[PDB]
Amino acid sequence: SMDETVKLNHTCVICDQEKNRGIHLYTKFICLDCERKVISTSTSDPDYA
Amino acid sequence: SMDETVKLNHTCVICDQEKNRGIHLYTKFICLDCERKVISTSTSDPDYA
Ligand SMILES: [Zn+2]
Ligand SMILES: [Zn+2]
């Protein structure tokens, strides 16, 4: 096992904080808060032109 | 300016790839693909008990 960084409280790829609640795409972890933040940030699909 | 890592193609906090399309919460960047991936992964709110 030398690829995926698991850890007990997975460190938030965003917050840099060790959290046990969130998701994991590849080997990383977006904390559940950021995980919702993202959905909330992406709400700008159209451009400003 | 010594806090936020901008860069031209913001590196995906997930893919480790330099992408100009995606979001940014704090100082990081989830590529737009991962940004959708997350929403898709979080669809497991209830527990397996
Ligand atoms: Zn976070
Ligand atoms: Zn990505």
UniProtKB/Swiss-Prot annotation, chains A, B:
What is the source species? Bacillus subtilis (strain 168)
What's a GO biological-process term for it? sporulation resulting in formation of a cellular spore
The cofactors named for this UniProt entry are: Zn(2+)
| Residues included from the entire protein | 1 to 48 of 64
* Domain of life the protein comes from: Bacteria
Q: What is the effect of changing residue 48 to A?
A: No longer inhibits or interacts with sigma-G
Q: Name one GO molecular function term.
A: metal ion binding
Q: What happens when the gene is disrupted?
A: Premature expression of sigma-G factor (sigG or spoIIIG) activity during the early stages of forespore development. Spore formation continues normally. However its absence has deleterious effects on strain robustness and is strongly selected against in competitions experiments.
Q: What does this protein do?
A: An anti-sigma-G factor, prevents premature activation of sigma-G factor in the forespore; overexpression leads to 1000-fold reduction in spore formation, spore formation stops after engulfment. Overexpression also inhibits sigma-G transcription activation activity. When both Gin and sigma-G are expressed in E.coli Gin inhibits sigma-G, strongly suggesting Gin inhibits by direct physical interaction.
Q: Does the keyword Transcription apply?
A: yes
Q: How and how many cofactors are bound, per the record note?
A: Binds 0.5 mol of zinc/mol protein, probably 1 zinc per dimer.
The induction comment states:
During sporulation under control of sigma-F factor.
Q: What is this protein called?
A: Anti-sigma-G factor Gin
Annotated TM spans: none
Q: Which sites bind Zn(2+)?
A: 12, 15, 31, 34
**Assigned keywords, A-Z:** Metal-binding, Sporulation, Transcription, Transcription regulation, Zinc
Task: Tell me the subunit arrangement.
Answer: Probably functions as a homodimer. Interacts with sigma-G factor, recognition occurs via the first 71 residues of sigma-G.
